[PDB]
Amino acid sequence: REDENNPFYFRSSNSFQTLFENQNGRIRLLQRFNKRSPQLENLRDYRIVQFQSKPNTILLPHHADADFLLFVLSGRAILTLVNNDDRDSYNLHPGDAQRIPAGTTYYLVNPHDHQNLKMIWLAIPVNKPGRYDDFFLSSTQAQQSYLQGFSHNILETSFHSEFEEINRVLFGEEEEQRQQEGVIVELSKEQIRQLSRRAKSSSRKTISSEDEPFNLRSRNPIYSNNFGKFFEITPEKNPQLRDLDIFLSSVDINEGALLLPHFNSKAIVILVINEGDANIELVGIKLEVQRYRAELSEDDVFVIPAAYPFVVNATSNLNFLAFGINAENNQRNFLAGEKDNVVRQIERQVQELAFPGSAQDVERLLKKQRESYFVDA
Amino acid sequence: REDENNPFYFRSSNSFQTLFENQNGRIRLLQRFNKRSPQLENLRDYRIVQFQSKPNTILLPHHADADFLLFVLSGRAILTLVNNDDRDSYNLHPGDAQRIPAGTTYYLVNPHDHQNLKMIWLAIPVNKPGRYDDFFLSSTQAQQSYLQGFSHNILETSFHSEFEEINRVLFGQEGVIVELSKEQIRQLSRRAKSSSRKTISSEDEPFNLRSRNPIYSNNFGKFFEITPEKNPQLRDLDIFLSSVDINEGALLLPHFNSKAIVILVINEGDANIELVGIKLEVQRYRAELSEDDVFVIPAAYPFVVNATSNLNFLAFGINAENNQRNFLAGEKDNVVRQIERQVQELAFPGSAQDVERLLKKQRESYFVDA
Amino acid sequence: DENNPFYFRSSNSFQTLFENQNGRIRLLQRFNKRSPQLENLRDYRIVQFQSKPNTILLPHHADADFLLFVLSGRAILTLVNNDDRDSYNLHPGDAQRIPAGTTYYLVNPHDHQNLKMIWLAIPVNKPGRYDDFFLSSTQAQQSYLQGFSHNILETSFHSEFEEINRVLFGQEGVIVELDEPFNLRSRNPIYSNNFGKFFEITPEKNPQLRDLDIFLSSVDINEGALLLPHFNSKAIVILVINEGDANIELVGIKPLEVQRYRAELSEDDVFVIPAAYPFVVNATSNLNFLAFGINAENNQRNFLAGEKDNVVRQIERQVQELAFPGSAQDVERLLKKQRESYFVDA
């Protein structure tokens, strides 16, 4: 079972509906994990969102029908969350994760003058499982302000103004030239040079922060050697992550290397390729062993059900982000290698029954791979 | 999307199914939220029940496979929860709320001699999402005791008696809501505990929403609300309760709840509601509301309430924990005003001065003179 | 019978997962596909496990959280983690939880006397449906490791496929012929008389159970006696008959019409009582059933006859004379004729 016929593989060229596109940027939405394959029913409440904007741009003020968990892959972002009585600005860098609670009004700036901003947001809708909506305050040539949803009368009395003034100042649909083109607009260094001022960054101490942004590489990867690096922040360590019962991981795999076969005890992992190419082999039980395989590339998404063993083989320098749903107390069990090899953790005698070989034949074999987590392919 | 084609509008005249009814009172169950419209799939575990009783009446003893959050719209009530090893009676007044764990045997008295008892109970069924059953102990005519569910042999071995005795004494009044004398009523109202400022955080006793200052208040309206952070019962249901008053010819400014799904039910008066959804195409949903009418405001959808006559509504806020209420006009809690000047310039066709001048014209907050 | 959506008879209700000379593993049918009235039990599945003396279930794991309970016999449950390990000596009555996706193997270190167990399953990837992953390699199944190609297997193991295949790939079946677990009856029961005993461990008492919001109860009913009519306030109970047999009458609510659900239960039988649904258990021989309390936190047990926990006897006199046709006097006169509690003779 491979490509297309593989329910866990989500080739990017045919798995994304774009919510909005412009010459200034683009927001894409991965299709529903369960509409795709009913086998991923417990991921019905989640959605993957890809975001990218050009230098000097800003995603206009809006709020969504869902709770988001942002992650910066590359570039710098300036996230400002506007509440009803004040405001909070965060300067995000690659590796940064920040939580935007459901229904929170915000805008996002890419302050880099010669570079793009690339992100991956995890959406968790509140009203209808798996589906949400963006409400934009602004009125652009691309979409109406949601305030246009109330009648002139209410707007007039609500704002204590004649509708002519309300329309002129906030909507301006009578002269599109005074309107912005879409939800993502370009800026001049001048403008940007202003918004950036006043903004909190992440730092060693925020890994434990209740509301500030935290970086995945603020600590030593849990696994690291000549072939790859595996960084991960768990619910136990971060309060935002604990609220969602999710873990985050960023892992690098060198060209020609593979992340040993292994499985997660309880976490359903959503993995998306950020860069590179790789071959992933997943194992299910039709007790006939079922082989699910695919060739992954940039922007592809692949999900690994809990307890399903898998392997990532890098055909070029690779890097992927990973969301561990139902992460609480998860245990990663490697099937090969020295460290965390659940296999070679069984009692000699039991190993003898489990396999044709024997006490020594088994262990002798399980001792041939001297490396751990990442090995050379 | 006008009232009828509006999936979030529930006109009482055609949205409730009567469970029981006689000259003494009426219990109504509102149609399932999601089977009305798939857009409210996340309310499937919830159901609204309306309870009306005449002066000097009693809802006979019974339990249900559903958690119940009671709320007294008007009138007075004596609620007594009968546990397996004791009994607790409660004197409920208007604005009082109380959680009734699922499967708790109880009976409800209307102690007044001239005023009706009106209540709205939020039900959260335990066995099947959105559907539950009432198990009445009494053996009236409108229904048999669920005790008659066991065969004669069992009933006899159980109570240690001849079936004729058990049958004549327990299995043999009319309906589940019967009338009674004023003397019988005083005999049942003497031990009822009332709510009080030191019960707001009670884990099992009734708390009054209005026994505290409202969060928003002025010449045109009063907005009362108790959250999960303040009350442990609400925290268990992750719900917030709000009671708001609006003077005729006034409205509750456009605003949206960040994460709460609101179940709005009209107590008295009338009002026009405008809810706005998306699909980016803006969808308009409006309606004219009256007593007993229900309307749900999905989380994050902006809405406005325009009272056509002295109004008061009750609202259950689902997924209440940390909900943030954002207004779009008015001085206080106006999220639009928190947007940086530069971004207001970008986001709107007008300048920064234009937006700020416009955003400051409405000098009041929350409620304004329509 | 067979028309009582709450009755599950070990005969046409289960489905053998594995079966061989050394034991059997049956997986109960889905509560919800069975009857739409048991939707809130869709995440749960019952598994009946049996193993003859001196046998062992080879290493494996499932994408499901388990709650084991020893109906009879002894077993040595060993959990193998990614860098540690710890075995538990299970005795009848002992309860133990196996976190989802944990690799483990179970043994029967006794002769003659077998291993009889019931497991509560809570699947992780898709409600009510899980899969077992066996590391071992036998004629019954391939090791899941065979899911990886030769090249990949060669690299991971740093060895020519020739050997990983000779030492790991190619016995008979999955049952070859060879925090801390808590015992239910290790403490005094809650109800105790001459006709039976009622043992129960609630979530508020055990942290493992608190995790699952589940209570465990083991009750005994001397033949002739019966568990007095009663209903759990909020818990949905799944009872399984261990020894003996008995009759059960469960009353539901269709004017409101009383619905009746009754059945004759035997060994390995399973029956579910919806929360708040009144019922009675009548032992037609020495009886002992196991019960899983779902949605357990703060559950209240209300009896309808007897001296203790009699919710009916807790209703105010006036209201009683109002609820029933008899007088306030003839009602208490009646309600007081049973000096027994929980269990009474028949």
UniProtKB/Swiss-Prot annotation, chain A:
Q: What does the UniProt PTM comment say about this protein?
A: The N-linked glycans are not essential for the folding and assembly into trimers.
A GO cellular component annotated for this chain's UniProt record is: protein storage vacuole
The question of whether Cell wall biogenesis/degradation is a record keyword is answered with: no
Pfam families to which the protein is assigned, alphabetical: Cupin_1 (PF00190)
How is expression of this protein distributed across tissues?
Expressed in seeds. Not detected in cotyledons or in mature plants.
The keyword Endoplasmic reticulum belongs to this UniProt entry's keyword annotation: yes
Q: Which controlled-vocabulary keywords does the entry list?
A: Allergen, Endoplasmic reticulum, Glycoprotein, Seed storage protein, Signal, Storage protein, Vacuole
Q: What is this protein called?
A: Beta-conglycinin beta subunit 1
State the organism named in the record.
Glycine max (Soybean)
